[PDB]
């Protein structure tokens, strides 16, 4: 595909202004929950490496890890959804503007299509 | 050296890389490469000894030759078209010269010979920096001119790098040479998708950087540079060995680990372009990297090697310094496969 | 042309006179009977090379004074000289100018 | 890869030195200023693939100005034919080309 | 037409390069490189690059090859592609070189930083210990 | 592209080949690198002067400065190697091996 | 005045070259007299070798290196 | 591709100004003061047409005007001008500074005879305007037709249909 | 204030060269931004004609453009003469 050269694109914007027209991801999104799980695993591994009680060494540190992971994951999900929306928009626009390359296939019914039958013996 | 001088040199290396990444003039890219080379040598030679000096002079010779070739390619491109902007190369000969220079900078085969020796000579921190940060600038330059590369040469050197890394990692007992051959193989994987998709190249670069950071930080934590020295790690800090085994399994491309993401996506993208044989050979060859990763895991964590009496004192002491982000790097290099569709962010 | 001829004349005269000096007393018959590698001199040579490079940077100054952007060129020239002085000061304070 | 910091901030760190037709000091023109200007105006906003396929005339003229391969080839052919004719003996140069002409200011 | 003086200088340049590329007795290789640098300076001067040729002949020859020799001593077709008009009442090469302080602010900054870093790097490497 | 450019490119190729030979004497390697940068300087200067591109008269100076700095760095490395082994022989740098 | 004289001199040299070229290349089969090497019809400043290509060596060398060698 | 058109040798015949550089330098200030209109017409045509073959008549006109100027000089102020350009020819740099006396003699002679005032500093370097009947060229560069730009698609963004649609992922 | 005065008096002794160097360098850095003649230098650089002044095509809408060099319209150089 390559959208780097796409027209009217700002050089260092994480989320353009046109991205705000899309529904934001919910706070109960499964991907956000997985990011929180990743942060919790990072906290547990941090506790284990420092030779501390893994489950209950630092509650504030684990909370900070989970919150940071959730925050970054939310913004990443927003950007990903925007990029896929752009891909679909460009696809549909190109299909609209080039009718000769995407003709309507003449619909055909199976009762009048001859398919070879291969017996299993 | 003085910590102020070390910080200034690290900032100069990073600023040279950023100058390469942000400039649109070929002369400025060359200047960024020169600045990075100039500031890199003391970092490699930080712990003064004959081995570090030999590694530094080998690295200097290789990088100076590559920079001279790159300058020659720029001058030929200017000769055949009065252009300084980094765009389409405009000349077949200029493109060939530039590709070889960037391969020499990256260490792609057949220009791989310097990587294992330079990595063995330098310490583990210099090895981490050399194998992680020193790949950004040449890969970015290759990405900017990916539409000009001849696919035959790029694919040939990529497959050669994969084969060379797989074969050369089998023969090593030193951990740094193993990491160097792994880096060569991963570079070969990265450059086999530039003709088709640069997003896959960047995704592979990010995944490999995370995995390599995790592995080098684990090796620094348990100060071992040989297989037998790492075989003593279970008797003091078994958690480090278990995490290292999981990271090694991830680096071998075994699903559902994070390391399966780049190979999967690259194979899928290459198949979209009616290329079938090369991904099959590439996976077959990556089996060798997985094999020597498994040998390291066997020697490290899955079995218990004999220990020594003097480990009883080491049992009584704790690490004075704890490396931040080690936990984050392990998790990111282990458990990010379900987040695969996030690559559309043009990472 | 003129410069080539002048250099050729200088070289020819020097060669002729040196050779006659070395061969006039060669016609009459007579009897006809380490490691140290001081590091300081190398540092002096390297410092000379670096300062010569910065001087080469400073050389286009006589023509840079007619640019209509006097403030910018003054700032840049002062910046170059300040970094030259900074290099000298750094090598001074790091015991790089001692014997 | 490429982070367009200059275009984001409008800095112009190195764009002034990229092309011949971009504000030389004292308005000194490049030798091939017109050809490169025409080629750039042809290919602006069109994209690399279309610029290569459609603006080939302008780029060919620009390369001809830059390296002058065709002009030198033509001059060499003319001089070779003149040499052949003067060796054979049916052509004599005019006084204009023999140094016997009358110069003008 | 002096039998292609530029061609003769180019052949002398290439011959000198073959001379010191054989790498005999590095002092003799340095002498060959000195001859090659002088021939290249002559080429640039005859082309019209007075200041750039003088920069070659001064900086390269008198500093870098001199330091090389010092360190060694410690140890054991043309005339056709030319222009037609004139330049005005100045030399375009000098104007373009002097534009470094009015146009090349970025270049001056990066080059000065690189030179200072090179000084620091030389000091750190030569400390030893 | 006339014959002078071909001669300079041939000089660059000869210098590169001489660098890649390594009979001995790393000082000769540095000499070959400096010959390469000198050839680059000459050929870039000819290109820039021929086309009357005024603003690239800077670039040869920058190239010369940076390459001479690299030369100083290489000389320092060679001096350290020689102080380590007593000679600048190439074959003495065999401690690290593939 | 210098600009006008320069234009007239260049045009005269081009015309003389065209005349001698037409005389010389009369018997070449595929040759065309006064054919441009550019696709565009815009006026292009001639090279040094376009004006003095058929002239004698002394004034070729003059027009090429006189200013450089004048000291 | 095409034939280069050149004017005949007859079109390039004109009565040349056969005076040397010293005479021209001595008379330059009054020459610019008096012969400004044809010179500016010629130079405006020269930077507008970008073609020497389109500016021959103006060159003949400026030659004629310079000839008339020098004929007036010969008719009225021959000998002061002769001494002045004798100065200017003697010097290797042809400096005005060396015999300001002869310059004053020539200036007062021309002021008395033809009523000419020498231009002051900064006057001959001014940018002037030219009233000309020559039509403005429409395509001096002989440019072709520019290729049409890309369609520039625009609209309101909609969510991606069935999400990423990457393998088994439902989002 | 006393410490700075003592430092300056101690540096003026046994190190006069460095004191003079720093004084001259600081003065060279500072004074140009305060002198009023730097604008005069810029204006002088503006008034040096290296190029031919190309005339403009008159359309009856340029009262500020002189028709002849002797016309009062256009920039003047009397200030340069008075300098
Ligand atoms: C499929 C996805 C779904 C599942 C995800 C799978 C992964 C999940 C977890 C990921 C990682 C996060 C946690 C790991 C931290 C490591 C700490 C550790 O070692 O454990 C010690 C610790 C107990 O020990 P301790 O008393 O604290 O102190 C002992 C010292 O820690 C140290 O004791 P020691 O040093 O004396 O003992 C040494 C020992 C200790 O060394 C270790 O055990 C190291 C830990 C393994 C490495 C982890 C790698 C990172 C993640 C990779 C996951 C791979 C999955 C992919 C599938 C392939 C499988 C390999 O090492 C050895 O014995 C050497 C031989 C090793 C044997 C072979 C190695 C195989 C390792 C592969 C493990 C992969 C799965 C991990 C599952 C969790 C394991 C804890 O375990 C825990 O208690 C933490 C476990 C999780 C806590 C859950 C609490 C939440 C429940 C309450 C809320 C309910 C939730 C639901 C909400 C709704 C209800 C209302
Ligand atoms: C280990 C697991 C640790 C805990 C993880 C917690 C989050 C689990 C999310 C996992 C899936 C993430 C995702 O990409 O979802 C998109 C999508 C699910 O979106 P959906 O189908 O619209 O949502 C259905 C929900 O039931 C619709 O529910 P909703 O829209 O009402 O959401 C309310 C929210 C409720 O939020 C909370 O409850 C917050 C407190 C917790 O959802 C949840 O937190 C409950 C979990 C939902 C699971 C959705 C995925 C189902 C297929 C895969 C099941 C894998 C099960 C593994 C263990 C899962 C344990 C939960 O999943 C997929 O596209 C296929 C995923 C297939 C497996 C992943 C691919 C890798 C396979 C190898 C695994 C290797 C693991 C690492 C080694
Ligand atoms: C191991 C997995 C990857 C981890 C990556 C490191 C995590 C920490 C990084 C913290 C966030 C860094 C983002 C920087 C903030 C602003 C970024 C913005 O300004 O830049 C944009 C760029 O945004 C970034 O590229 C997005 C980075 C997001 C990385 C996540 C993708 C990882 C792949 C899927 C694995 C799931 C990982 C989830 C857990 C972290 C615009 O780029 P643009 O100037 O226009 O063009 C340059 C790029 N081109 C050339 C390729 C087109
Ligand atoms: C924005 C973010 C700032 C913080 C991050 C800084 C990153 C590293 C520092 C390097 C960046 C510095 C920015 C300088 C960019 C150069 C362009 C800008 O400065 O404008 C110039 C103006 O020049 C300024 O005067 C430069 C002043 C800055 C240099 C002085 C100090 C530099 C120090 C920077 C770091 C170097 C090492 C550290 C030293 C302590 C152009 O002048 P102008 O005349 O309009 O246009 C010329 C074109 N003409 C001829 C057609 C008209
Ligand atoms: C083209 C490249 C194709 C890539 C093929 C990759 C095959 C995957 C395994 C590669 C292992 C090769 C290395 C090896 O085994 O060395 C012999 C090794 C030496 O032992 P070391 O542990 O190295 O030293 C012990 C003394 N200190 O001997 C062994 O241990 C052999 C035990 C492992 C056997 C594994 C069986 C693998 C073969 C299965 C069939 C398919 C193989 C894969 C390709 C098949 C063809 C499509
Ligand atoms: C400011 C002005 C300075 C000008 C520069 C210097 C000009 C040089 C002028 C040269 C003057 C002539 C010098 C000749 C004398 C040479 C010395 C001499 O006396 O040699 C005697 C020597 C002794 O030999 P034997 O007796 O056989 O054996 C003794 C050993 N058992 O006898 C000879 O060799 C005689 C050599 C023949 C010399 C005759 C020609 C004179 C030379 C003319 C100068 C030529 C160059 C001009
Ligand atoms: C802000 C302006 C910056 C630009 C101007 C500078 C241009 C050139 C000057 C810089 C050159 C490099 C300076 C290097 C500094 C080296 C410092 C040093 O180490 O010197 C000390 C000795 O000197 C010192 O004490 C250090 C510096 C002392 C202070 C110098 C002057 C400080 C400021 C004075 C002027 C203030 C402003 C002037 C106002 C005057 C009123 C008009 C050691 O000397 P030794 O060789 O070891 O000999 C000692 C054995 N007998």
Residues within a 6 A CB radius of ligand 1? A 41, 44-45, 48, 53-55; B 238-239, 242-243, 246, 301, 334
CB I65 within 8 A of CB I74: yes
Alpha-carbon separation of residue H38 from D9, H20, H45 (angstroms): 49, 21, 11
Does residue B110 have a cis peptide bond before it, meaning omega lies within 30 degrees of 0?
Answer: yes
Q: How many CB atoms lie within 10 A of CB H162?
A: 10
- First-residue to last-residue Cα distance in chain I: 43
Q: Is residue A115 part of a domain?
A: no
Chains contacting chain B through 3 or more C-beta pairs under 8 A: A, D, E, F, H
Among C51, C77, C86, C89, the mutation site with the greatest number of ligand 7 atoms within 8 A of its Cβ is C89
Q: Please report where in the chains the tokens 């603006």 appear, as a residue.
A: D55
Q: Any residues with CB less than 8 A from the CB of G47 and at least 6 apart, and which?
A: D68, D71, E80, E81, E82, E83, E84
C-alpha to C-alpha distance for E55 and B56, rounded to whole angstroms: 31
Q: What are the φ and ψ backbone dihedral angles of H11, each rounded to 5 degrees?
A: -65, -20
Q: How many CB atoms lie within 10 A of CB B193?
A: 26
Chains contacting chain F through 3 or more C-beta pairs under 8 A: B, C, D, E
Q: What are the φ and ψ backbone dihedral angles of A107, each rounded to 5 degrees?
A: -60, 140
* D13 vs A contacts (CB less than 8 Å): none
CA angle B238, B244, B250 (to 5 degrees): 145
Give me B230's structure tokens. Answer: 């790492």
Rounded to a whole number of angstroms, the distance from the CA of F93 to the nearest CA of chain D is 36
Nearest to H127 by CA among C3, B117, I67, D72: I67
Helix (H) or strand (E) holding I57: strand I56-57
**3-state secondary structure (DSSP) of residue C97:** coil
Helix (H) or strand (E) holding H130: strand H129-130
Q: From which experimental method does this structure derive?
A: cryo-EM
Q: Is residue A80 part of a domain?
A: yes
Q: Is residue F97 part of a domain?
A: no
Which of H122, H129, H136 lies at the smallest CB-CB distance from I55? H129
Q: How many CB atoms lie within 10 A of CB D89?
A: 7
**3-state secondary structure (DSSP) of residue B83:** coil
C-alpha to C-alpha distance for D8 and A16, rounded to whole angstroms: 13
Look at chain F and report how many structural domains it folds into.
1
Among B287, B290, B292, the mutation site with the greatest number of ligand 5 atoms within 8 A of its Cβ is B287
List the residue whose alpha carbon is closest to atom 9 of ligand 2.
A30
| Yes or no, beta carbons of G34 and H58 under 8 Å apart | no
Query: Do C and E make contact, counting contact as 3+ CB pairs within 8 angstroms?
Result: yes
Q: Which letter, b or e, does each residue of C34-65 get, where b requires 16 or more Cβ atoms within 10 Å of its Cβ?
A: eeeeeeeebbbbbbebbbbbbebbebbeebbe
Alpha-carbon separation of residue F61 from C30, E60, F72 (angstroms): 56, 11, 17
* A10 vs D contacts (CB less than 8 Å): 8
* F79-86, long-range: CB < 8 A, 24+ apart: F79/C39, F79/C42, F79/E71, F79/E126, F80/B53, F80/E125, F80/E126, F80/E128, F81/B53, F81/B54, F81/B57, F81/F26, F82/C37, F82/E75, F83/C37, F83/C39, F83/E128, F84/B50, F84/B53
Alpha-carbon separation of residue H76 from B238, C84, H31, H125 (angstroms): 113, 64, 15, 28
CB D43 within 8 A of CB D51: yes
Alpha-carbon separation of residue B342 from A74, A79, B345, H61, H87 (angstroms): 11, 9, 6, 75, 84
Sequential DSSP letters for B125-174: HHHHHHHHGGGHHHHHHHHHTTTTS-HHHHHHHHHHHHHHHHHHHTT--B
C-alpha to C-alpha distance for I1 and I17, rounded to whole angstroms: 23
Alpha-carbon separation of residue H71 from E49, F53, H24, H33, H66 (angstroms): 44, 44, 13, 16, 9
Residue C24 Cα to ligand 6 middle (Å): 7
Q: What is the CA radius of gyration of chain H?
A: 30
Alpha-carbon separation of residue B278 from B112, B151, B157, B181, B272 (angstroms): 21, 13, 12, 20, 13
Burial class for H142, CB neighbours closer than 10 Å (0-12, 13-18, 19+): middle
E93 touches chain F (CB under 8 A): yes
Q: What are the φ and ψ backbone dihedral angles of B225, each rounded to 5 degrees?
A: -120, 0
| Yes or no, beta carbons of D2 and B22 under 8 Å apart | yes
Number of helices and strands (H, E) in chain C? 4, 0
Q: Is the CB of E109 under 6 A from ligand 4?
A: yes
* G71 vs C contacts (CB less than 8 Å): 2-3
**Which ranges of B170-259 does DSSP label H, i.e. alpha helix?**
175-191, 198-221, 227-230, 238-251
Burial class for E82, CB neighbours closer than 10 Å (0-12, 13-18, 19+): middle
Q: With the CA atoms of A78, A82, A84 and A88 taken in that order, what torsion angle do they form, in degrees rounded to the nearest 10?
A: 150
CB D49 within 8 A of CB H154: no
Q: Is residue A20 part of a domain?
A: yes
CB B191 within 8 A of CB B201: yes
C-alpha to C-alpha distance for B218 and B225, rounded to whole angstroms: 11
C-alpha to C-alpha distance for E62 and B88, rounded to whole angstroms: 40
Helix (H) or strand (E) holding E122: helix E105-127
Among I4, I15, I24, I28, the mutation site with the greatest number of ligand 7 atoms within 8 A of its Cβ is I15
CB C54 within 8 A of CB F61: no
Q: Please report where in the chains the tokens 């680990």 appear, as a residue.
A: B257
Give me B75's structure tokens. Answer: 């001058």
**C residues 69-88 closer than 8 Å to I (CB):** 70-71, 74, 78, 85
Residue B85's DSSP bridge partners are B25
Instruction: Please report the atom of ligand 1 found closest to the CA of residue B234.
Output: 64
C-alpha to C-alpha distance for H51 and H28, rounded to whole angstroms: 26
CB E77 within 8 A of CB F37: no
Q: What is the CA radius of gyration of chain I?
A: 25
CA angle B195, B198, B200 (to 5 degrees): 110
Superfamily of domain C1-94: NADH:ubiquinone/plastoquinone oxidoreductase, chain 3 (1.20.58.1610)
Q: What are the φ and ψ backbone dihedral angles of I20, each rounded to 5 degrees?
A: -65, -40
H20 touches chain I (CB under 8 A): no
Residue F56 belongs to a domain with what CATH number?
1.10.287.3510
Q: Please report where in the chains the tokens 């390391």 appear, as a residue.
A: B259
Instruction: Please report the atom of ligand 5 found closest to the CA of residue B295.
Output: 22
Q: Is residue F86 part of a domain?
A: yes
Question: Hey, where are the domains in chain E?
Answer: 5-127
Q: What are the φ and ψ backbone dihedral angles of B264, each rounded to 5 degrees?
A: -55, -50
CB A86 within 8 A of CB H157: yes
Which of E74, E101, E111 lies at the smallest CB-CB distance from C73? E101
Resolution of this entry, Å: 2.7
Q: Is the CB of B285 under 6 A from ligand 5?
A: yes
Look at chain A and report how many structural domains it folds into.
1
Query: Do B and A make contact, counting contact as 3+ CB pairs within 8 angstroms?
Result: yes
Residue C26 Cα to ligand 3 middle (Å): 83
Nearest to B118 by CA among B206, B33, B185, B181: B181
| Yes or no, beta carbons of A83 and B344 under 8 Å apart | yes
Q: How are beta strands H129-130 and I56-57 bridged, if at all?
A: parallel
Site from E5, E35, E40 to mutate, F interface, most F CB atoms within 10 angstroms: E40
* F53 vs D contacts (CB less than 8 Å): 20, 30
CB D8 within 8 A of CB A10: yes
* C6 vs G contacts (CB less than 8 Å): none
**Which ranges of A10-58 does DSSP label H, i.e. alpha helix?**
30-49
Residue D11 Cα to ligand 4 middle (Å): 9
Give me F92's structure tokens. Answer: 């003495």
Among I10, I18, I20, the mutation site with the greatest number of ligand 7 atoms within 8 A of its Cβ is I18
**3-state secondary structure (DSSP) of residue A86:** helix
Nearest to D76 by CA among B80, G7, G37, H6: G37
SS (H, E, C) F2-67: CHHHHHHHHHHHHHHHHHHHCCCCHHHHHHHHHHHHHHHHHHHHHHHHHCCCHHHHHHHHHHHHHH
C-alpha to C-alpha distance for H96 and B89, rounded to whole angstroms: 54
CB B346 within 8 A of CB A3: yes
Q: Containing domain of residue A13, as a range?
A: 1-98
C-alpha to C-alpha distance for E20 and A97, rounded to whole angstroms: 65
Q: How many residues does this entry show for chain C? A: 99
C-alpha to C-alpha distance for B337 and D33, rounded to whole angstroms: 54
**3-state secondary structure (DSSP) of residue H119:** coil
Question: Could you say which DSSP state residue H28 is in?
Answer: H
C-alpha to C-alpha distance for F49 and G46, rounded to whole angstroms: 17
C-alpha to C-alpha distance for B160 and I31, rounded to whole angstroms: 64
C-alpha to C-alpha distance for F48 and F58, rounded to whole angstroms: 10
Give me B106's structure tokens. Answer: 């990256």
Nearest to H65 by CA among G1, B276, E70: G1
Sequential DSSP letters for D2-28: ---HHHHHT--SSGGGS-TTS--GGGP
Residue B307 Cα to ligand 5 middle (Å): 29
Q: Containing domain of residue F72, as a range?
A: 3-92
C-alpha to C-alpha distance for F80 and F87, rounded to whole angstroms: 10
CB E10 within 8 A of CB F10: no
Whether domain E5-127 has CATH 1.20.120.1200: the reply is yes
Burial class for D87, CB neighbours closer than 10 Å (0-12, 13-18, 19+): exposed
CB B231 within 8 A of CB B300: yes
């Amino acid at each position: 595909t390559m959208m780097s050269g796409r027209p009217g694109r700002v050089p260092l914007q994480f989320l353009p202004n046109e991205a705000r027209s899309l529904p934001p991801p919910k706070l109960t999104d499964p991907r956000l929950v997985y990011m929180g799980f990743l942060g919790y695993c990072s906290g547990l591994i941090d506790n284990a490496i420092r030779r501390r009680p893994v489950v209950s060494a630092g509650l504030h540190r684990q909370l900070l890890y989970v919150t940071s992971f959730v925050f970054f994951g939310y913004y990443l999900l927003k950007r990903q959804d925007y990029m896929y929306a752009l891909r679909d928009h460009d696809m549909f626009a190109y299909v609209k503007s080039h009718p000769e390359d995407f003709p309507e296939k003449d619909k055909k019914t199976y009762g009048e299509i001859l398919e070879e039958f291969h017996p299993v013996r | 050296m003085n910590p102020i001088i070390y910080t200034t040199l690290i900032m100069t290396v990073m600023s040279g890389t950023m100058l390469v990444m942000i400039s649109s003039h070929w002369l400025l890219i060359w200047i960024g490469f020169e600045m990075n080379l100039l500031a890199m040598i003391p970092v490699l030679m930080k712990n003064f000894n004959p081995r570090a000096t030999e590694a530094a002079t080998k690295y200097f010779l290789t990088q100076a030759t590559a920079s001279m070739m790159l300058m020659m390619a720029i001058i030929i491109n200017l000769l055949y078209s009065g252009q300084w902007t980094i765009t389409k190369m405009f000349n077949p000969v200029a493109m060939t010269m530039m590709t070889m220079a960037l391969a020499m900078k990256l260490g792609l085969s057949p220009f791989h010979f310097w990587v294992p020796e330079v990595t063995q000579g330098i310490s583990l921190q210099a090895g981490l920096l050399l194998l992680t940060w020193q790949k950004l600038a040449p890969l970015s330059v290759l990405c900017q001119i990916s539409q000009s590369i001849n696919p035959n040469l790029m694919l040939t050197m990529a497959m050669l790098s994969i084969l060379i890394g797989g074969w050369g990692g089998l023969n090593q007992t030193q951990l740094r040479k193993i990491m160097a051959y792994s880096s060569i193989a991963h570079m070969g994987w990265m450059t086999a998708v530039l003709p088709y998709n640069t997003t896959m190249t960047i995704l592979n670069l990010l995944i490999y950087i995370t995995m390599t950071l995790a592995m080098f930080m684990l090796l620094i934590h348990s100060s071992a540079t040989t297989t037998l020295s790492l075989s003593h790690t279970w008797n003091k800090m078994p958690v480090i060995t278990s995490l290292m085994m999981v990271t090694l399994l991830s680096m071998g491309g075994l699903p559902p680990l994070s390391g399966f993401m780049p190979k999967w996506m690259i194979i899928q993208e290459m198949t979209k372009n009616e290329s079938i044989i090369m991904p099959t050979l590439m996976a077959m060859t990556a089996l060798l990297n997985l094999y020597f990763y498994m040998r390291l895991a066997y020697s490290s964590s899955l079995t218990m090697f004999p220990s020594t009496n003097n480990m009883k004192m080491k049992w009584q002491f704790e690490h004075t310094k704890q490396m931040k982000l080690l936990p984050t790097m392990i998790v990111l290099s282990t458990l990010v496969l379900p987040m695969t569709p996030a690559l559309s962010s043009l990472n | 042309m003129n410069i080539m001829l002048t250099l050729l004349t200088n070289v020819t005269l020097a060669s002729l006179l040196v050779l006659i000096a070395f061969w006039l007393p060669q016609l009459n018959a007579y009897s006809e009977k380490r490691l140290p590698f001081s590091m300081k001199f190398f540092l002096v040579a390297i410092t000379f090379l670096l300062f010569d490079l910065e001087i080469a940077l400073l050389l286009p100054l006589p023509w840079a004074s007619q640019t209509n952007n006097l403030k910018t060129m003054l700032t840049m020239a002062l910046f170059l000289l300040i970094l030259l002085a900074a290099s000298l000061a750094y090598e001074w304070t790091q015991k790089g100018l001692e014997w | 890869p490429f982070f367009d910091v200059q275009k984001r901030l409008g800095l112009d760190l190195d764009r002034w030195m990229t092309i011949q037709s971009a504000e030389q000091p004292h308005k000194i023109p490049g030798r091939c200023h017109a050809f490169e200007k025409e080629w750039i105006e042809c290919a602006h906003g069109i994209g690399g693939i279309r610029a290569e396929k459609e603006c080939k005339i302008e780029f060919d003229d620009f390369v001809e100005c830059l390296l002058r391969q065709k002009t030198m080839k033509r001059l060499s052919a003319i001089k070779r034919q003149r040499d052949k004719l003067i060796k054979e003996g049916k052509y004599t140069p005019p006084p204009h080309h023999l140094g016997k002409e009358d110069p003008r200011p | 037409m002096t039998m292609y003086i530029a061609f003769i200088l180019s052949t002398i340049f290439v011959i000198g390069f073959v001379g010191f590329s054989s790498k005999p007795s590095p002092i003799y290789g340095g002498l060959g490189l000195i001859v090659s640098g002088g021939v290249g300076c002559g080429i640039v001067l005859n082309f019209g690059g007075s200041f750039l040729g003088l920069m070659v002949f001064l900086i390269y020859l008198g500093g870098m090859l001199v330091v090389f020799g010092y360190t060694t001593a410690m140890a054991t077709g043309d005339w056709v592609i030319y222009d037609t008009g004139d330049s005005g009442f100045f030399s375009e090469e000098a104007m373009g070189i002097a534009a470094l302080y009015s146009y090349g602010t970025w270049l001056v900054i990066v080059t000065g930083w690189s030179l200072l870093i090179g000084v620091v790097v030389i000091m750190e490497i030569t400390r030893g210990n | 592209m006339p014959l002078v450019y071909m001669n300079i490119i041939m000089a660059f190729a000869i210098a590169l080949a001489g660098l890649l030979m390594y009979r001995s004497h790393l000082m000769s390697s540095l000499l070959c690198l400096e010959g390469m940068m000198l050839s680059l300087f000459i050929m870039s200067t000819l290109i820039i002067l021929n086309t009357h591109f005024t603003l690239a008269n800077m670039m040869p100076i920058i190239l010369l400065v940076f390459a001479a700095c690299e030369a100083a760095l290489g000389l320092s490395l060679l001096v350290m190697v020689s102080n380590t082994y007593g000679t600048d022989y190439v074959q003495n740098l065999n401690l690290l091996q593939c | 005045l210098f600009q006008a004289e320069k234009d007239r001199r260049v045009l005269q040299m081009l015309r003389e070259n065209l005349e001698e070229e037409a005389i010389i290349m009369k018997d070449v089969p595929d040759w065309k007299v006064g054919e441009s090497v550019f696709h565009t019809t815009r006026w292009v400043t001639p090279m040094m070798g376009e004006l003095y290509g058929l002239r004698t060596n002394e004034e070729i060398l003059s027009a090429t290196y006189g200013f450089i060698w004048y000291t | 591709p095409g034939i280069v058109e050149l004017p005949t040798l007859e079109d390039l015949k004109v009565q040349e100004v056969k005076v040397s550089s010293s005479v021209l330098k001595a008379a330059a200030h009054h020459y610019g003061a008096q012969c400004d209109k044809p010179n500016k017409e010629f130079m405006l045509c020269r930077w507008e047409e970008k073609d020497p073959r389109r500016c021959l008549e103006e060159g003949k006109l400026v030659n004629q005007c310079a000839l008339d100027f020098f004929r007036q000089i010969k008719r009225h102020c021959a000998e002061p001008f002769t001494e002045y350009w004798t100065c200017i020819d003697y010097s290797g740099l042809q400096l005005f500074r060396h015999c300001r006396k002869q310059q004053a003699k020539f200036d007062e002679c021309v002021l008395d005879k033809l009523g000419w005032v020498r231009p002051d500093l900064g006057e001959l370097s001014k940018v002037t305007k030219v009233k000309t009947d020559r039509p403005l060229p429409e395509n001096p560069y002989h440019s072709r037709a520019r290729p049409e730009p890309n369609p520039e698609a625009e609209g309101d963004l909609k969510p991606a249909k069935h999400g990423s649609r990457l393998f088994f992922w439902t989002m | 204030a006393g410490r700075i005065a003592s430092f300056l008096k101690n540096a003026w002794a046994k190190e006069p060269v460095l004191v003079a160097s720093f004084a001259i360098g600081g003065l060279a850095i500072i004074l140009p931004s305060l002198s009023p003649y730097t604008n005069y230098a810029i204006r002088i650089n503006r008034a040096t004609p290296y190029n031919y002044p190309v005339p403009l095509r008159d359309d009856g809408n340029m009262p500020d453009v002189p028709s002849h060099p002797q016309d009062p319209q256009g920039p003047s150089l009397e200030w340069l003469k008075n300098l």
